Amino acid sequence: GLGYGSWEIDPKDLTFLKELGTGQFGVVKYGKWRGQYDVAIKMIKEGSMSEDEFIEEAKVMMNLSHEKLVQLYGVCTKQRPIFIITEYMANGCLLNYLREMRHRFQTQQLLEMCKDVCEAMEYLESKQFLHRDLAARNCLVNDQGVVKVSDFGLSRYVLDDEYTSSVGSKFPVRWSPPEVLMYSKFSSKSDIWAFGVLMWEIYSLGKMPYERFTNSETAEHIAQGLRLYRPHLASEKVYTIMYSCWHEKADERPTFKILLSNILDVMDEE
Ligand SMILES: O=c1[nH]nc(-c2ccccc2)[nH]1
């Protein structure tokens, strides 16, 4: 209504129900919009985000609609703090979900999680939109066990330099190809590399990549041409897919369309 653009939600339409924990921009809550519609509400900590830039980008992000992408419903702007309102994912972060041994996952379920992510990424690739921080920590799981990709592109608005400098203590070294670590060359193919690492995280039930190495050691290992190796739960064909994402030459890495085809082949065969 009157004082609101299409990207803007009236915070007075929110009912807060449960705390969901803290992320990098601060508190996240579960609530309802207009009494009925489940939402997640991110309260953006003052000084954590380039807010005017993020708000302009929210206009673009709201047009990205795919069933395996966590939907952005809008932003509560011109208040402190601002809120980001998104599709609620009742089973929480993928990384924590994988680490819960009670689930006793079959490998068919693990491949389905990879396929869910791959479908989201093929869609983003088709829109020339890079995620820029693909990892299990940035995927969520709904009440049906479907995995969706979250927070796509948001790293561009993070003001904490520890996160944004390749040398910063919070940079995602372990999800980065050599050309990112060496010269900050981001591309579709750096998303591809990250996706390979994410498949490794899924098949490793949420182990940290390069778990025995520091970030500095990881960067040296990768830059010298060495890689992660096969998780016990990955078949040879699954391992071949994740490994293909790690070619030293970025142009020899597959596209998300090719990865999706390869994943569906393995689903049929295995
Ligand atoms: O953007 C979203 N949607 N849903 C969540 C969520 C986060 C933590 C725990 C449970 C759900 N975050």
Could you explain how this protein is built, in words?
It is a single chain. This protein has 270 residues and is α+β, with helices and mostly antiparallel strands. It has a domain at 92-269: Transferase(Phosphotransferase), domain 1. Helices cover 35% and strands 16% of the residues. The protein has nine helices and eight strands. The protein has helices at 51-61, 94-99, 107-126, 161-164, 178-183, 188-203, 215-223, 236-244, 256-269; strands spanning 14-23, 26-33, 37-43, 72-76, 83-86, 92-93, 139-141, 147-149. The strands form two sheets. The chain has a five-stranded antiparallel β-sheet, with helices on one face. The chain has a three-stranded antiparallel β-sheet with strand order 6-7-8. Helix 3 packs antiparallel against helix 6 and helix 3 packs antiparallel against helix 9. The radius of gyration is 19 Å and the shape is globular. Bound molecules: 5-phenyl-2,4-dihydro-3H-1,2,4-triazol-3-one. The site of 5-phenyl-2,4-dihydro-3H-1,2,4-triazol-3-one has 13 residues, from strand 1 and strand 6. It is classed as transferase/transferase inhibitor. Keywords: cytoplasmic tyrosine kinase, transcriptional regulation, nuclear factor-kappaB, transferase, TRANSFERASE-TRANSFERASE inhibitor complex. The assembly is monomeric. The entry is titled "Fragment-Based Discovery of a Novel Bruton's Tyrosine Kinase Inhibitor". The protein is Tyrosine-protein kinase BTK.
